[PDB]
Amino acid sequence: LVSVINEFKKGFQASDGSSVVVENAEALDPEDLEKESVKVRKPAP
């Protein structure tokens, strides 16, 4: 019986496709995202 059980397990088609041998949440607005900036005390180039 144990040998028969193992032989059967050799080719048992599990539900999830694994042998038994042995969303897309809501997007985010960039404006919500906060950017880490570097302060520069000079006129813009």
Partner 1 sequence: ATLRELRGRIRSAGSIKKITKAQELIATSRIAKAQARVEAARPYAAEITNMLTELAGASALDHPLLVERKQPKRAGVLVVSSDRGLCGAYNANVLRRAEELFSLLRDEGKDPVLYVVGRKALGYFSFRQRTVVESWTGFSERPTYENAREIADTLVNAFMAGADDEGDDAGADGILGVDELHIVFTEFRSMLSQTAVARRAAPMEVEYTLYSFEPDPETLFDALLPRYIATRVYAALLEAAASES
Residues that bind partner 1 (CB under 8 A): 23-30, 32-44
37 in Cβ contact with 31 (< 8 Å): no
* Cα-to-chain-centroid distance, residue 7: 34
Nearer to partner 1, 3 or 15 (CB): 15
Question: Smallest gap, in angstroms, from Cβ of residue 16 to partner 1?
Answer: 12
Question: Smallest gap, in angstroms, from Cβ of residue 18 to partner 1?
Answer: 14
Nearer to partner 1, 22 or 25 (CB): 25
- 3-19 burial, b for 16+ CB within 10 Å, e for fewer? eeeeeeeeeeeeeeeee
